């Protein structure tokens, strides 16, 4: 319905400008401070090292930036592997899920080329498995609810409301198992704050996958089973979450 | 069938182990290239500037890292959180692309981002479905003229349906995969392969962030910055439709 389509366009377009205003107002001040700190660091270095021109230091910094950007670590001079078998497994998963954290980048042209086909074939394959698991999990959940639903029907609360309350229990546990449980897990395991962990979980299950936070990626932890196993969580959550994302969609269409 | 999905799980897993082996074999031998480059930069600097100790340069590099980590950029209009870039960043969310080349630093930023997405993604999905339908219509409608030609040529109506799909995607591909990749090559001084990698990583909504095109506007070519936003919208729609139908073919199978 062309009218509706343009209305929707204007709407979203406003949802974005709205987002923009908020993130600017919330993040720009931190950013301008950092830009200031960098310049302070340069100026301090010049005053200490008269054998260095501002312009030369500038190049040093550009070169250092490029290397850190490529995943160099400031702390050391040079063991653990980003591409070790467990981590590579994990990396692939990030593709077919479309999450795409990207905390570790491909460097080889061959890597990029293979990645293209790996995804084109991998994502639809995964989508199908996901639909499958979504149906199967909902079924298991629905059968489970039925037994407690039987108790509500005896208590003479209407079949219409009993169904609604069950939803509340239904998601609340789902959320408990897939949102709340993991966030509590991650806080303790990754040294994140409550809020960081929830941020991570949600960024993950929406498949946004910023990559600022990645469970397991931490170099120090000797926890091999953990990170793929987390992927096991990711499978459940993503399915449970997909069920939800369509539904907030329905509510949105209704208004 | 539950048995069948369990079988499907194993298939995937093998698809993952298979992927793992390839990336490991392809990338492990370059894990440490960036360190090596950093060290080279240090050692070169020391040789040029005898008034600097390794340890002092070390701190410089830590302090620089902290600042870049906060969003600073090397100087020699760069604001990632000015209006235009924040708009773009919000887009990366509702699309679920999530490049992440710019991170949120504030806890408030993270908190707001959660709700922004929960409400934003479904809202965008709906607009996307809408645009997918409207665009598919324009496409299929155009193809209609060629379909008329095939029907005259007494090509079976069933194959005519197939050729139209091939066209349907092939024409999109030209406009949405091939055209942009050629565009970006020239604009971003990326290689042919880098550009395709980018395009596809983007339209699959994987959004690694190693390559990003539309974050800031380009003086001397104004149309660039929006055209990309427009492109992403259409491309995402064209890609979704492929997936739903290839998904569509897949689920019955």
């Amino acid at each position: 319905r062309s009218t509706t389509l343009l209305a929707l366009l204007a709407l979203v377009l406003l949802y974005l400008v709205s987002g923009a205003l908020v993130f600017r107002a919330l993040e720009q001040p931190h950013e301008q401070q950092a830009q200031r700190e960098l310049g302070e660091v340069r100026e301090k270095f010049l005053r200490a090292h008269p054998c260095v021109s501002d312009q030369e230091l500038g190049l040093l910094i550009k070169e250092v930036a490029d290397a850190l950007g490529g995943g160099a670590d400031p702390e050391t001079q040079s063991s653990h592997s980003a591409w070790d078998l467990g981590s590579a497994f994990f990396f692939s998963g990030t593709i077919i899920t479309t999450i795409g954290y990207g905390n570790v980048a491909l460097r080889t042209d061959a890597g990029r080329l293979f990645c293209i086909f790996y995804a084109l074939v991998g994502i639809p394959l995964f989508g199908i498995l996901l639909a499958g698991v979504g149906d199967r999990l909902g079924s298991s959940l629905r059968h489970g609810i039925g037994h407690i639903e039987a108790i509500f029907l005896k208590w003479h609360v209407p079949p219409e409301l009993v169904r609604v309350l069950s939803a509340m229990l239904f998601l609340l546990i789902g959320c408990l198992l897939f949102v709340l449980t993991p966030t509590f897990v991650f806080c303790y395991m990754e040294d994140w704050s409550k809020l960081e962990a929830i941020y991570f979980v949600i960024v993950t299950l929406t498949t946004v996958g910023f990559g600022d936070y990645v469970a397991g990626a931490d170099p120090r932890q000797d926890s091999p089973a953990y990170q793929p196993l987390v992927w096991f969580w990711i499978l459940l959550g993503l399915a449970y979450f997909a069920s939800v994302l369509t539904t907030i969609g329905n509510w949105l269409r209704v208004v | 069938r539950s048995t069948t999905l369990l079988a499907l799980l194993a298939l995937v897993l093998l698809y993952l182990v298979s992927g793992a082996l390839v990336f490991r074999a392809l990338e492990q031998p370059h894990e440490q290239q960036a360190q090596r480059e950093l060290g080279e930069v240090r050692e070169k600097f020391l040789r040029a500037h005898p008034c600097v100790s390794d340890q002092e340069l070390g701190l410089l590099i830590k302090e620089v890292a902290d600042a870049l980590g906060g969003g600073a950029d090397p100087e020699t209009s760069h604001s990632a959180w000015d209006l235009g870039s924040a708009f773009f960043f919000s887009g990366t969310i509702i699309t679920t692309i999530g490049y992440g080349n710019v991170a949120l630093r504030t806890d408030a930023g993270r908190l707001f981002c959660i709700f922004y997405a929960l409400v934003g993604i479904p809202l965008f999905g709906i607009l996307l479905a809408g645009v997918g339908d409207r665009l598919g219509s324009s496409l299929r409608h155009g193809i209609g003229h060629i379909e008329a030609i095939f029907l005259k040529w007494h090509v079976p109506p069933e194959l005519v349906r197939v050729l139209s799909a091939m066209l349907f995607l092939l024409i999109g591909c030209l406009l949405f995969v091939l055209t942009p990749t050629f565009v970006f090559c020239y604009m971003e001084d990326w290689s042919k392969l880098e550009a395709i990698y980018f395009v596809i990583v983007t339209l699959t909504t994987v959004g690694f962030g190693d390559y990003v095109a539309g974050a800031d506007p380009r003086q001397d070519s104004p149309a660039y910055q929006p055209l990309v936003w427009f492109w992403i919208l259409l491309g995402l729609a064209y890609f979704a439709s492929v997936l739903t139908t290839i998904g569509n073919w897949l689920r019955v199978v």
Partner: antibody, heavy 116, light 107 residues
Framework: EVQLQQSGPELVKPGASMKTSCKVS????????MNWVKQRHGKNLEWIGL????????TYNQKFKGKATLTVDKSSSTAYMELLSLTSEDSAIYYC?????????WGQGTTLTVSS | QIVLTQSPAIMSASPGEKVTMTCSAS?????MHWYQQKSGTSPKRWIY???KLASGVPARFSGSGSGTSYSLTISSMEAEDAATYYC?????????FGAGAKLELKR
């Protein structure tokens, strides 16, 4: 007592080029950045560019990118500036001064006259 | 290409008077430096890093400021203070200069 001693006034024809020098004493030539500055009869000061005597590195004010070449002789701890295809607009006083953030020591200046 | 404005370009002071000359920057700057020039001779570093006094300089001189606004002050004018004063910046390359402020003796 740091000192930058510049060579004497120079007179050249329009179209010619010119080279002028600045010897340093009282400190280590290769330890500090050298700059040149133009002052056209008693008016604003204009930074021409710098050279790092130790590394050979140079950068120039965009205004002077084509016009001026900076070099150094490490052994005699002397800095040089060459100016090219001179016009009457180039007649001015030119200083060498030292520094990477403030210009802490200056030569006494040298006057360039461009004339027929 | 930060631009430094010194206004007014000319001023005069009787001996004993307090003198203040200012430098506004087109965009923020972390430190300002000042040079004294007497006609016939090269500029001398006078004040650097906003408020540090160079070796020779008498204490009647001071400097202050921040961000985009900086100033040089003489608590009590003297005769040998007649000169041109220039501000300069190097928080961004290329370094740049104000166009000078000429300070003559009143009489």
């Amino acid at each position: 007592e740091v000192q930058l001693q510049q060579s004497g006034p120079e007179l050249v024809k329009p179209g010619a080029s010119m080279k002028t020098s600045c010897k340093v004493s009282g400190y280590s030539f290769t330890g500090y950045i050298m700059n040149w500055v133009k002052q056209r009869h008693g008016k604003n000061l204009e930074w021409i560019g710098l050279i790092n005597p130790n590394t050979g590195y140079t950068t120039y004010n965009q205004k002077f990118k084509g016009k001026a070449t900076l070099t150094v002789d490490k052994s005699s701890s002397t800095a040089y500036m060459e100016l090219l295809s001179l016009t009457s607009e180039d007649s001015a006083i030119y200083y060498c001064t030292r520094g990477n953030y403030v210009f802490d020591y200056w030569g006494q200046g040298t006057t360039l006259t461009v004339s027929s | 290409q930060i631009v430094l404005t010194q206004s007014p370009a000319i001023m005069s002071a009787s001996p004993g008077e307090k003198v203040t000359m200012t430098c506004s920057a087109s965009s923020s700057v972390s430190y300002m430096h000042w040079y004294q020039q007497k006609s016939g001779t090269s500029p001398k570093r006078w004040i650097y890093d906003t408020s540090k006094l160079a070796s020779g300089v008498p204490a009647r001189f001071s400097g202050s400021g921040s961000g985009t606004s900086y100033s040089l002050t003489i608590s009590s004018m003297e005769a040998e203070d007649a000169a041109t004063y220039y501000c300069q910046q190097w928080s961004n390359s290329p370094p740049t200069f104000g166009a000078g402020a000429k300070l003559e003796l009143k009489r």
